[PDB]
């Protein structure tokens, strides 16, 4: 179904599937953690809905859907966070009423290193002039790709999204050499994003071992990464 789409219709299906930007509730360690986990728990509900609208995703079986979302969820929250922060260099925009700087990341231990890496990614997107159309393509790639190795259809749909990315780069005038160079740069960043998500998962599990309380969706998703 997904595979019958043109590159232009892939882009429009993805742009239209985008979740909305959520507000934080209107700082010590636990008050900050409380704001972020509440926010992250709400954004998870919309991510599951965005996922269902990603073409090819509804075609998967239920347990395969579950597997992909459990592997990918924190990478997906991270790349959305990174994208919204692009135009606030220096800062992370968690919600429009929750823009934090580097220094506020210290109110939580072990958070300062994760903050810095997120800031470097956004800085990198900023200096590549990443466009919203490429961003939606990367986000989809992370959902289909992160758990695919733990199928032919999934690979066929990733092949479809790559073509969409190159089609976006050719529409923007870039040469053939620039197109493959740019494609490479964008996918290599996914490997940093996987790395951040792994430091982030450990950080969350030890937060759970102390006591911010973790319940509901967010707890379940974290437990899924044993």
């Amino acid at each position: 179904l997904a595979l019958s789409l043109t590159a232009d219709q892939m882009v429009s299906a993805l742009l239209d599937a985008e979740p909305p930007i959520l507000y934080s509730e209107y700082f010590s360690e636990a008050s900050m953690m409380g704001l972020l986990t509440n926010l992250a728990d709400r954004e998870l509900v919309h991510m599951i809905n965005w996922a269902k609208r990603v073409p090819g995703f509804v075609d998967l079986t239920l347990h395969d859907q579950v597997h992909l979302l459990e592997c990918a969820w924190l990478e997906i929250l991270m790349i959305g966070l990174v994208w919204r922060s692009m135009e606030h260099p220096g800062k992370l925009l968690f919600a429009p009423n929750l823009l934090l700087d580097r220094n506020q990341g210290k109110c939580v231990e072990g958070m300062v290193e994760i903050f810095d890496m997120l800031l470097a990614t956004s800085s990198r997107f900023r200096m590549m002039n990443l466009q919203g159309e490429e961003f939606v393509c990367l986000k989809s790639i992370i959902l289909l790709n992160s758990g695919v190795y733990t199928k032919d259809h999934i690979h066929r749909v990733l092949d479809k999204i790559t073509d969409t990315l190159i089609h976006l780069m050719a529409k923007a005038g870039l040469t053939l050499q620039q197109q493959h160079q740019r494609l490479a740069q964008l996918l290599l960043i996914l490997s940093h994003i996987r790395h951040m998500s792994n430091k982030g998962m450990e950080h969350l599990y030890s937060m759970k071992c102390k006591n911010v309380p973790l319940y509901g969706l967010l707890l379940e998703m974290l437990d899924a990464h044993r």
């Binding site: 269902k52 859907q65 579950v66 979302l69 969706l217 379940e220």
Partner: peptide, 8 residues
Amino acid sequence: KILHRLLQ
């Protein structure tokens, strides 16, 4: 489980 229910 929760995740199951949201996916439907």
